[PDB]
Design a protein around this ligand. Sequence first.
Ligand SMILES: CCCCCCCCCCCCCCCCCC(=O)OC[C@H](COP(=O)([O-])OCC(O)COP(=O)([O-])OC[C@@H](COC(=O)CCCCCCCCCCCCCCCCC)OC(=O)CCCCCCCCCCCCCCCCC)OC(=O)CCCCCCCCCCCCCCCCC
Ligand SMILES: CCCCCCCCCCCCCCCCCC(=O)OC[C@H](COP(=O)([O-])OCC(O)COP(=O)([O-])OC[C@@H](COC(=O)CCCCCCCCCCCCCCCCC)OC(=O)CCCCCCCCCCCCCCCCC)OC(=O)CCCCCCCCCCCCCCCCC
Lengths: 94, 485, 192, 77, 33
Amino acid sequence: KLHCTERSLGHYNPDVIRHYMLQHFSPENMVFVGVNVNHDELCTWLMRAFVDYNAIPPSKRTVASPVYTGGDVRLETPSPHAHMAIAFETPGGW
Amino acid sequence: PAPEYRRVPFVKEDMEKVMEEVPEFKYYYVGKENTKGNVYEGIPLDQSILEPADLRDYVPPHSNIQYSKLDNGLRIASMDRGGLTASLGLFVHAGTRFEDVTNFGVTHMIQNLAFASTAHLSLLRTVKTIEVLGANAGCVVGREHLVYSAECLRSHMPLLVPMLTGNVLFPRFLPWELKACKEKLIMARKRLEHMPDQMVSELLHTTAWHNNTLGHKLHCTERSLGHYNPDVIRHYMLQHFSPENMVFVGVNVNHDELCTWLMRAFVDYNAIPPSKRTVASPVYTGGDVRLETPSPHAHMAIAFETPGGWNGGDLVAYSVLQTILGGGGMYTRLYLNVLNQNEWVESAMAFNTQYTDSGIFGLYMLADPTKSANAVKVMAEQFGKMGSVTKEELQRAKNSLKSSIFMNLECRGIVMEDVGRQLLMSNRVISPQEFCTAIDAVTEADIKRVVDAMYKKPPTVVAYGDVSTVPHYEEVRAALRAAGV
Amino acid sequence: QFHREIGKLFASYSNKITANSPVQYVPSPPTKGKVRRALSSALMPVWFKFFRGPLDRWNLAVMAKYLRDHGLMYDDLYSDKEPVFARALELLPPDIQAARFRRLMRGTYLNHLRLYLPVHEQNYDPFIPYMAPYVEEAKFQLQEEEELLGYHMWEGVWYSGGVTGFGDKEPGEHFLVALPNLYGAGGSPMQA
Amino acid sequence: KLEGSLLPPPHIPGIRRAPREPASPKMAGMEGRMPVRLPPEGSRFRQYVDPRADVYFPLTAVLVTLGPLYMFSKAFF
Amino acid sequence: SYGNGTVLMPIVRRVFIGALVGIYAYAATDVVL
Ligand SMILES: CCCCCCCCCCCCCCCCCC(=O)OC[C@H](COP(=O)([O-])OCC(O)COP(=O)([O-])OC[C@@H](COC(=O)CCCCCCCCCCCCCCCCC)OC(=O)CCCCCCCCCCCCCCCCC)OC(=O)CCCCCCCCCCCCCCCCC
Ligand SMILES: CCCCCCCCCCCCCCCCCC(=O)OC[C@H](COP(=O)([O-])OCC(O)COP(=O)([O-])OC[C@@H](COC(=O)CCCCCCCCCCCCCCCCC)OC(=O)CCCCCCCCCCCCCCCCC)OC(=O)CCCCCCCCCCCCCCCCC
């Protein structure tokens, strides 16, 4: 899921958060983009933001392949219409 | 072999003479005639204050059930045990299994409007007079039956009969009373959400009988509020609330006196006329449903269909199997083979829910949310061996079942509900002595026969609570198929 | 036990009423005596012709002209501050409630200007009793409540919970419970 | 046709109609005035009413009240 | 009636009425009877 649940509130403390950023927020896993800017000037100020302090160090991570299962789910709710959706898997993605 | 019903004919009586038989009742006490006070002042309770004129030679009462019927078709049955508190009940064959897409929720509405204003008595005077008499009364809705009941001192029976029958004879359904009841109509399912056991049961029914008969819900929904008007209600009662579809039962009452006052409640006014209705057969589909909710446990239930239900011919066999496994004990199969060999299991049990012509049978477990995959493997292994029992297990189960039956029937309430429920579902009452004879004739082959038939249709799977590690629908089905299920 | 003796007198008079109570409708007895019902019938042909008769007819003309000038019905003159009539207004269906709302608005405006309606807007009977079914049902509801709950003078905690303790249920409606708070922003009883 | 402010009701299945009084004869003395009905036919009040007395009422009212008081006061007070 | 706290005015009503019945009865017995 995208958002939290009432169960998620059981681990909403700084140590859990900081442990997640140390595994994923290294510079190698980030890209910066600008539109309507001078390229050289953007590089200079980005260099100055990182020169005096230490960034999160890199880490090797293995990306697990998704497992498609399909299935069926219903959700009743007050509404005048019956919403229905049917889908299939696209191998390989982008 | 149905029971023989005695006839009670309608008779026209002078009103002023029948008033000489109504029990005394007071709401106001304007002074007091007696002026002697507490004549037992100063006498301690280790000393008796009775006189010889208060002694009698005991004569046992008539404890067998007696049967009678009125001319409009109402069936009556009562028994007297000599107690001083009576139980009264009016059973109607009009449950949620008779609703349709334009009616969902109507039976729940009728239950919450019980004891409201009638043609001859208002809501306030009805509920206030019951309280002052010292009685308790209520209405309970079900999937096949609706029941109105009251309990009171046995001298107040004539006063309570009309306040029970009026709900089905001439209710008014006033607009402003319907608008005052709409609040408590939604708070039912809301209160149901925080009751795990009741939620797992509902999910089991909705999933077993998809969109038909026994799969309809008990309570209303926000959608139901679109047809909550008197015309819809009154149309439902005209199809189902005829006297032929009703039974009245009393315990600790005089049979003849109960018939007289029931006859007097129906003699001067017209009842809903009979109608021929065809009862649709349930369609069992099985399936799977999940419901995530904040909880420390993973609730899981798996069940199968029982062909024929109460009238299928194998009711006693499923009740013996339930006793072997373990219900709600420390030598049952589930306590020795499951609980003692797994410390991460918090509980486990077997259930057996039977209706007039269909039922379900299965297991129910709580466990550690991190070992749901193992909970499924243990349940499948138990289903794989259900069709095999030893002589010691079987003999110990029979003895446990017979004792439970006779012991349950020591209470007034259970006796009343059992007699009325049996006469609507089968038009006959099976005695506990006949149950025992049937229990003793259950063999090892019968057990193995009913388990195989049970497995010829798909299962019904339910999960509730923390379902973070509950396998996929296809994996549960496959595990069952590897254990021979 | 002096209280038990007084209770015996109350009880004797109580049982006598019950033993002499009929079990069906019986017409009420005439109020006025025979001596008074004989003088009236003898003087009636003269008293009614020249005084009481024209008094009745002038009264209905005065009422009809005032109501029609403002476009009102007679039943519009009753107040919602009467408990019986307030309950009756709660039982009305939408269409009748809307027409009353509109007539009351129009009559306040006409009384402010002091201008008559045209004659062709006055052609109606103002004495139709459109509230009667709802008034008689209201009387029945409130007579039950009074007999089942209000038959004794009940005690209570004094000056507690915003009420005085002598029977009031809505708070702050008597002077000795005025000014509920010294600080804060207060609040509404309808938002509790 | 009908007495008072009523008109013949339309026939609509489902609506039971109460009986309505028919129109009765008029009496002398109401020309030019806003109409007010007379007592019913079978009634003692109808045998005694006369609309012509309405015109004199402003004086009759003063005499029945202030008259006796003035004579009683002029005799004993 | 039940539900309100207007509890003194009904007492004032019965005292005033009684007082009036006594004033006009003490004057008649002195003038007439
Ligand atoms: C402790 C320190 C030392 C000194 C202590 C002094 C004594 C203190 C305690 C006294 C007793 C307290 C308990 C009273 C009875 C409660 C009974 C009960 O539970 O019933 C609830 C009962 C409600 O019953 P209900 O059936 O729901 O409703 C009744 C209906 O409304 C109407 O029903 P109904 O139409 O059937 O009529 C019923 C009527 C039938 O009877 C009659 O009609 C008979 C008429 C007899 C007439 C001739 C005798 C004269 C009677 C009084 C005349 C009018 C006086 C007006 C005074 C105004 C100024 C106070 O019944 C009565 O009249 C019974 C009441 C008689 C008692 C009145 C005098 C004593 C109490 C005074 C108030 C208590 C002090 C409060 C202090 C607060 C300070 C913050 O409530 C009452 O009847 C309350 C009555 C008392 C008045 C309310 C409080 C008034 C506060 C404002 C004044 C404060 C002044 C402070 C400064 C001065 C010094 C005090
Ligand atoms: C606030 C926001 C703004 C900013 C802040 C402002 C700050 C300033 C505010 C004040 C702060 C300080 C606190 C002050 C507290 C004062 C006390 C208070 O609040 O009590 C309210 C309190 C009401 O409390 P409540 O919570 O609203 O309701 C109480 C119950 O729970 C429920 O009861 P209920 O609803 O059923 O009925 C209540 C009803 C109950 O009604 C009654 O019981 C009747 C009361 C009036 C009777 C007299 C009127 C005339 C009647 C006809 C004549 C009768 C003659 C006597 C014979 C009668 C037959 C035997 O009471 C009323 O109608 C209220 C009347 C207001 C009375 C206020 C007088 C206070 C004492 C000072 C008197 C000074 C008199 C000077 C003039 C005379 C000089 C010669 O009032 C009383 O009950 C006290 C009544 C006192 C009556 C005194 C009468 C004296 C004159 C008698 C006639 C003599 C004629 C002689 C002629 C001789 C010729 C030669």
